[PDB]
Amino acid sequence: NGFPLLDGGAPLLGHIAQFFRDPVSVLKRGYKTRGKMFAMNFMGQRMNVMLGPEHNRFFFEETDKLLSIRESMPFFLKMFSPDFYSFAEMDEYLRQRSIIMPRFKAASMKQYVPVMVEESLNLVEQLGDEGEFDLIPTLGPIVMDIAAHSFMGREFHEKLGHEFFDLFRDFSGGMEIVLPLWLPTPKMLKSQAAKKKLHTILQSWIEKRRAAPLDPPDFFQTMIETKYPDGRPVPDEIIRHLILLLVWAGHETTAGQVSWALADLLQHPAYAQVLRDEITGLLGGGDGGNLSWEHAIAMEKMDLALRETERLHPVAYMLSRKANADIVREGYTIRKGEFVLLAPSVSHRMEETFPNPDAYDPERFNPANPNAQTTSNSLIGFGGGVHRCAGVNFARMEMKALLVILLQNFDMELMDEVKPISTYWPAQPCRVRYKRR
Amino acid sequence: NGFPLLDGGAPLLGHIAQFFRDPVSVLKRGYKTRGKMFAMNFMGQRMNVMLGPEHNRFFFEETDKLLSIRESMPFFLKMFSPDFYSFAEMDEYLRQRSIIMPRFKAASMKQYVPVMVEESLNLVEQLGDEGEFDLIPTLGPIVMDIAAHSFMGREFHEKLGHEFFDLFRDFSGGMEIVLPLWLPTPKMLKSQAAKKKLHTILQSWIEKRRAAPLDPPDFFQTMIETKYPDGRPVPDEIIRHLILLLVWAGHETTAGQVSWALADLLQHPAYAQVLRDEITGLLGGGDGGNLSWEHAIAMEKMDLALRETERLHPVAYMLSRKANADIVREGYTIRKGEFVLLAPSVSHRMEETFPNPDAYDPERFNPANPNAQTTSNSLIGFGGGVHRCAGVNFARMEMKALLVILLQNFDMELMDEVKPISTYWPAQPCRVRYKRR
Ligand code: HEM
Ligand code: HEM
């Protein structure tokens, strides 16, 4: 019946402890020894992994039909609500998604670039003329500054920014597990407590700005005044959930992804020089404070670098669904209720799709390359289909801004070898030595 | 087909969040609205709860046959080994259990009483003439002193005791859960690290005492020299696992259970006086330092109090198995691979078995009571059958010693109301005000 089973499973535990220790290597061993469809054994549960563009297309296409999203993160419901976004019924999901999409399509990035540039320059200021910085701990707070400043406004970021960021780390803990009596980790209580406080703080700011509006409107003003397509008003609670969702969905992902991207550049000086020349051609000298959206969109080699870092180090190293019904696929049956996985980390390094898959070669995405590797559903570090990452343009633009400003200001080198760890981040410490240019 | 489903389940999550918040109240609601057999819904998994003496007897009798122990705590395997104790094949389990049973049958408690009394008197010394103490944080370290002193010896407890107790808190974290990419909590790494250090420290002590034996032998000396019944030697690794198992199995359980027992006594002064008179009749005045095993076994009213605290507040509030095959039971089918639970917390308060079940009435266990409630498999806070708690006599004797010595030395009162939370402990702070007698 089932997907071909990966061998080497331990008694009782199966592969789960191996996965615990190094998930991508477990996933790669499935590709190398079993192929594009294989089962892992997680404590007696079959985990059905599919690889490559055809299976990726199927996974995205069948989400909300044969494949269920909610069981990938059931306690999203408690962080947010059972009627919110991808957890809501189809009609309601689409209505709420219609609030988000116009604010995050590629055209809409004009809005956000000045805040991205300003906070990047604040980072340059904090770093000074020379020193060393740890990647994730340094860039994480900047990603968060950009999120809060962009989606809540400058004033909120100055006045309430400190209290807001502390509640978020607790809020983000709300995906906790349990101990043998089904006794819970503290973290779920702290997450609930932070959620209630985040909601009161956000509601106060909604009321503040509706009493005292900012015209012309920023993101926040437009958000709290938006209605659904049919004309009905968007409930305040939905607004609050949406904003928290954006900050949550974009925080640890972007901080890790951009850290991988800088690391890739610092390990490939020839291409970093390609990037420095593109930035210099567009911006001239100086600290990069003149970086505009119009400059940004012209940065074609930066775009290639960001695609290549996504390919080599997708922080979304695995994606997850549960089957709503039995699925027969190429002779194997996924049973109803079993997990179904994509693995961007492994799919992205299939020689069948990406020749020389361990090489850093951004020009493989250049459409003028006859050898180009741009088939649809082959680069899936942002998902796909209806449930593609809503922030994919915001994330790529923010990485571009952070890297441009850092490249323009600093000579940099990696101090440590990079190491691993859904979530795939450089192992701390991953430090950069720098000296201002 | 299934066990009657408890109503009130939330979308997707079922009852799991309700259970998270207050498990005994979920379990009680199953008894009150569905009866002795009911299903809970944990994120789409049926949890089959059975209640009362007949079902308890079945659960214990069928463990290792229709019911599997390992899936109740799969990562016991990593804390210990897949070939250790209840995780080993039947023959090997029984061989290793044959090392433990002679050291913990009721007759064998003579060995341990002097260490229990000494450490209890050390507690009296630390408390001084008056003050306040928090139950779990104060008595937890004493339970651990008694374990290390009893099973490793006085010298180990003095020299290596501090380092040993710090590694154990990390070791005990090794029952961790995960986050949405199956990304693990730190705690499993700390647990593994502590396990390796605990094993090296224990092996050094095995080698020390085999070079320099303690004659007459203490527990440790006899343990490292024991052979299996057939004459074959017990591997050092098994010895180390066994000792760690005893300390682990007895630490948080006994500290919580004895705290409940003191709380019950401080809430029922008339019976505490019954206890004080029994202690005075046996020991006279003084600090209780003359408490001997021969005195201890005569303390029939203390025995009743400990049974009644076990009934009202079993720290093992729930017990867990997975079905090895479909089990038909009174018209309902447990499917293979589903969880099967006992709930001592609820079973112990069934009016059908224990009339006036919320009353503290230790005399209900007195065999001279015509109304006595002593049917087999009705008091199950220590499990039952082949897999009954191996330490049940050691735990009861230690609680008796700790309470005797405290009652003999201090007038005490509860400062706070008691509150809840496998594991069921008084909610901290649960404080006792005391003044020496
Ligand atoms: C480099 C950074 C990021 C990566 C790698 C990333 C990746 C992803 C992936 C893989 C998905 C699809 C999940 C699945 O299929 O199970 C997703 C969903 C989502 N992401 Fe991102 N993300 C990033 C940044 C952001 C940012 C900055 C935002 C918001 C501004 C955001 C908003 C969302 C939302 C709202 C969804 C849900 C889409 C839906 O179900 O309709 N993410 N993200
Ligand atoms: C008041 C304290 C304690 C309580 C409430 C308690 C309770 C239990 C329960 C309910 C079980 C059976 C688990 C199941 O059926 O799933 C058990 C097993 C066990 N306990 Fe205790 N325990 C306590 C103290 C101790 C102490 C002090 C030791 C050791 C000195 C100990 C050693 C063990 C061992 C070795 C097992 C495994 C039995 C087997 O599977 O053969 N426990 N305990």
Side-chain angles (χ1 to χ4, degrees), chain A residues 1-27 29-45 47-128 131-161 163-168 170-175 178 180 183-195 197-226 228-231 233-251 253-334 336-416 418 420-421 424 426-427 429-432 434 437, chain B residues 1-27 29-45 47-128 131-161 163-168 170-175 178 180 183-195 197-226 228-231 233-251 253-334 336-416 418 420-421 424 426-427 429-432 434 437:
Chain A
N1 289 337
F3 273 29
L5 181 65
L6 175 70
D7 78 25
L12 191 69
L13 295 193
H15 305 101
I16 202 162
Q18 305 163 28
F19 193 85
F20 175 113
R21 294 193 292 273
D22 185 342
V24 175
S25 84
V26 177
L27 288 173
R29 210 168 59 79
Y31 172 57
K32 293 179 179 179
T33 73
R34 299 292 182 248
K36 287 179 287 143
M37 303 176 269
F38 63 92
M40 293 174 307
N41 175 3
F42 278 15
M43 293 177 182
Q45 264 201 123
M47 315 285 300
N48 301 299
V49 182
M50 315 181 303
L51 301 180
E54 178 25 54
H55 293 316
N56 299 342
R57 175 210 63 77
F58 174 80
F59 183 101
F60 301 140
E61 186 66 60
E62 289 305 320
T63 294
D64 301 317
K65 299 190 295 261
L66 293 164
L67 296 178
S68 170
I69 219 168
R70 293 189 301 171
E71 280 100 348
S72 91
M73 42 174 187
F75 288 97
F76 180 97
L77 179 162
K78 288 292 167 172
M79 277 183 69
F80 296 99
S81 64
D83 316 306
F84 171 66
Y85 219 73
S86 51
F87 272 54
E89 184 266 345
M90 188 38 75
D91 285 347
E92 182 65 10
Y93 164 66
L94 289 178
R95 274 191 299 272
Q96 305 180 17
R97 176 195 186 261
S98 88
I99 298 152
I100 286 315
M101 303 284 75
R103 296 156 166 86
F104 289 94
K105 62 184 169 102
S108 290
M109 299 295 101
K110 184 185 193 301
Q111 272 176 278
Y112 308 116
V113 180
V115 163
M116 301 170 169
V117 166
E118 176 181 350
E119 301 297 343
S120 288
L121 281 171
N122 283 349
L123 172 62
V124 167
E125 223 198 71
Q126 296 188 344
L127 295 175
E132 317 166 359
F133 73 87
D134 198 358
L135 282 175
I136 302 285
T138 304
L139 295 178
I142 313 294
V143 166
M144 182 58 57
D145 289 330
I146 292 166
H149 190 166
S150 296
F151 306 140
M152 289 312 287
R154 176 181 304 288
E155 187 180 346
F156 180 94
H157 183 219
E158 290 155 351
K159 309 204 158 274
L160 282 207
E163 174 185 354
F164 173 87
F165 303 144
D166 285 319
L167 291 163
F168 232 91
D170 282 3
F171 180 64
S172 314
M175 296 297 103
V178 296
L183 255 66
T185 61
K187 303 220 201 90
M188 172 60 100
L189 296 183
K190 309 216 289 176
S191 168
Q192 289 292 112
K195 174 194 168 165
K197 276 170 179 200
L198 285 160
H199 273 262
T200 61
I201 283 150
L202 260 58
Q203 191 58 33
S204 83
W205 216 260
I206 293 175
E207 304 295 2
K208 183 186 221 309
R209 302 284 296 282
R210 294 214 280 237
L214 183 62
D215 313 295
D218 62 355
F219 175 100
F220 183 75
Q221 202 68 48
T222 302
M223 176 65 55
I224 67 183
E225 290 169 5
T226 190
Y228 283 126
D230 61 356
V234 184
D236 285 355
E237 174 177 352
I238 298 300
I239 298 305
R240 297 190 321 259
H241 284 316
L242 283 172
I243 289 163
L244 297 174
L245 170 65
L246 295 171
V247 174
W248 176 65
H251 171 39
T253 47
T254 307
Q257 197 65 83
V258 78
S259 293
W260 278 120
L262 186 50
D264 281 337
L265 289 171
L266 302 181
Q267 278 168 354
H268 291 87
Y271 201 86
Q273 189 55 58
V274 177
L275 289 199
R276 266 162 65 138
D277 293 348
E278 176 176 83
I279 292 163
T280 293
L282 286 155
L283 299 189
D287 64 3
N290 58 332
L291 174 62
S292 77
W293 174 73
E294 294 82 2
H295 295 128
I297 55 174
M299 294 193 168
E300 56 179 51
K301 300 300 182 205
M302 179 66 71
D303 296 339
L304 299 182
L306 290 178
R307 306 297 179 290
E308 185 68 337
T309 285
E310 176 182 345
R311 189 185 64 76
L312 283 164
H313 318 287
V315 298
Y317 74 88
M318 195 192 33
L319 305 173
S320 181
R321 303 290 182 266
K322 267 192 35 160
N324 281 321
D326 290 7
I327 304 164
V328 173
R329 199 146 180 77
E330 186 171 334
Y332 311 122
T333 300
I334 301 160
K336 176 173 161 163
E338 284 172 4
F339 278 100
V340 179
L341 313 181
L342 301 188
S345 46
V346 171
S347 201
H348 287 175
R349 291 179 188 239
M350 300 170 52
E351 47 272 39
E352 337 185 359
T353 308
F354 296 107
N356 202 356
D358 301 335
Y360 181 81
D361 176 25
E363 290 295 333
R364 77 172 77 237
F365 294 105
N366 182 344
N369 184 345
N371 202 22
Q373 296 131 55
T374 49
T375 62
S376 73
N377 299 119
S378 52
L379 189 68
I380 58 151
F382 289 94
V386 177
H387 287 270
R388 190 159 167 81
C389 176
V392 58
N393 302 310
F394 188 94
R396 282 170 171 163
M397 188 58 71
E398 174 166 349
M399 300 199 272
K400 168 184 290 172
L402 263 165
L403 298 172
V404 168
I405 300 308
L406 287 174
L407 287 171
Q408 184 84 321
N409 276 282
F410 299 107
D411 292 309
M412 294 173 275
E413 60 170 4
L414 282 179
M415 297 176 72
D416 313 282
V418 203
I421 284 169
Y424 171 50
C430 196
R431 292 166 304 139
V432 180
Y434 62 94
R437 298 169 66 188
Chain B
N1 289 337
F3 273 29
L5 181 65
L6 175 70
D7 78 25
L12 191 69
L13 295 193
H15 305 101
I16 202 162
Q18 305 163 28
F19 193 85
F20 175 113
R21 294 193 292 273
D22 185 342
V24 175
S25 84
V26 177
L27 288 173
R29 210 168 59 79
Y31 172 57
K32 293 179 179 179
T33 73
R34 299 292 182 248
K36 287 179 287 143
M37 303 176 269
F38 63 92
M40 293 174 307
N41 175 3
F42 278 15
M43 293 177 182
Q45 264 201 123
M47 315 285 300
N48 301 299
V49 182
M50 315 181 303
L51 301 180
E54 178 25 54
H55 293 316
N56 299 342
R57 175 210 63 77
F58 174 80
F59 183 101
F60 301 140
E61 186 66 60
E62 289 305 320
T63 294
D64 301 317
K65 299 190 295 261
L66 293 164
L67 296 178
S68 170
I69 219 168
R70 293 189 301 171
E71 280 100 348
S72 91
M73 42 174 187
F75 288 97
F76 180 97
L77 179 162
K78 288 292 167 172
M79 277 183 69
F80 296 99
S81 64
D83 316 306
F84 171 66
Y85 219 73
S86 51
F87 272 54
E89 184 266 345
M90 188 38 75
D91 285 347
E92 182 65 10
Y93 164 66
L94 289 178
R95 274 191 299 272
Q96 305 180 17
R97 176 195 186 261
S98 88
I99 298 152
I100 286 315
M101 303 284 75
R103 296 156 166 86
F104 289 94
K105 62 184 169 102
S108 290
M109 299 295 101
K110 184 185 193 301
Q111 272 176 278
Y112 308 116
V113 180
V115 163
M116 301 170 169
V117 166
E118 176 181 350
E119 301 297 343
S120 288
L121 281 171
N122 283 349
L123 172 62
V124 167
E125 223 198 71
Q126 296 188 344
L127 295 175
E132 317 166 359
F133 73 87
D134 198 358
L135 282 175
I136 302 285
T138 304
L139 295 178
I142 313 294
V143 166
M144 182 58 57
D145 289 330
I146 292 166
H149 190 166
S150 296
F151 306 140
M152 289 312 287
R154 176 181 304 288
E155 187 180 346
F156 180 94
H157 183 219
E158 290 155 351
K159 309 204 158 274
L160 282 207
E163 174 185 354
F164 173 87
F165 303 144
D166 285 319
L167 291 163
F168 232 91
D170 282 3
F171 180 64
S172 314
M175 296 297 103
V178 296
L183 255 66
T185 61
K187 303 220 201 90
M188 172 60 100
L189 296 183
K190 309 216 289 176
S191 168
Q192 289 292 112
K195 174 194 168 165
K197 276 170 179 200
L198 285 160
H199 273 262
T200 61
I201 283 150
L202 260 58
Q203 191 58 33
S204 83
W205 216 260
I206 293 175
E207 304 295 2
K208 183 186 221 309
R209 302 284 296 282
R210 294 214 280 237
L214 183 62
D215 313 295
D218 62 355
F219 175 100
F220 183 75
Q221 202 68 48
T222 302
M223 176 65 55
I224 67 183
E225 290 169 5
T226 190
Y228 283 126
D230 61 356
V234 184
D236 285 355
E237 174 177 352
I238 298 300
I239 298 305
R240 297 190 321 259
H241 284 316
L242 283 172
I243 289 163
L244 297 174
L245 170 65
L246 295 171
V247 174
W248 176 65
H251 171 39
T253 47
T254 307
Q257 197 65 83
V258 78
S259 293
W260 278 120
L262 186 50
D264 281 337
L265 289 171
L266 302 181
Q267 278 168 354
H268 291 87
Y271 201 86
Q273 189 55 58
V274 177
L275 289 199
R276 266 162 65 138
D277 293 348
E278 176 176 83
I279 292 163
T280 293
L282 286 155
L283 299 189
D287 64 3
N290 58 332
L291 174 62
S292 77
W293 174 73
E294 294 82 2
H295 295 128
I297 55 174
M299 294 193 168
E300 56 179 51
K301 300 300 182 205
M302 179 66 71
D303 296 339
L304 299 182
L306 290 178
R307 306 297 179 290
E308 185 68 337
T309 285
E310 176 182 345
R311 189 185 64 76
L312 283 164
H313 318 287
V315 298
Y317 74 88
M318 195 192 33
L319 305 173
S320 181
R321 303 290 182 266
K322 267 192 35 160
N324 281 321
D326 290 7
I327 304 164
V328 173
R329 199 146 180 77
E330 186 171 334
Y332 311 122
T333 300
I334 301 160
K336 176 173 161 163
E338 284 172 4
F339 278 100
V340 179
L341 313 181
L342 301 188
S345 46
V346 171
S347 201
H348 287 175
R349 291 179 188 239
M350 300 170 52
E351 47 272 39
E352 337 185 359
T353 308
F354 296 107
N356 202 356
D358 301 335
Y360 181 81
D361 176 25
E363 290 295 333
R364 77 172 77 237
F365 294 105
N366 182 344
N369 184 345
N371 202 22
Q373 296 131 55
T374 49
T375 62
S376 73
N377 299 119
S378 52
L379 189 68
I380 58 151
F382 289 94
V386 177
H387 287 270
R388 190 159 167 81
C389 176
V392 58
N393 302 310
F394 188 94
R396 282 170 171 163
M397 188 58 71
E398 174 166 349
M399 300 199 272
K400 168 184 290 172
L402 263 165
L403 298 172
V404 168
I405 300 308
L406 287 174
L407 287 171
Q408 184 84 321
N409 276 282
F410 299 107
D411 292 309
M412 294 173 275
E413 60 170 4
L414 282 179
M415 297 176 72
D416 313 282
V418 203
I421 284 169
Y424 171 50
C430 196
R431 292 166 304 139
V432 180
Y434 62 94
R437 298 169 66 188

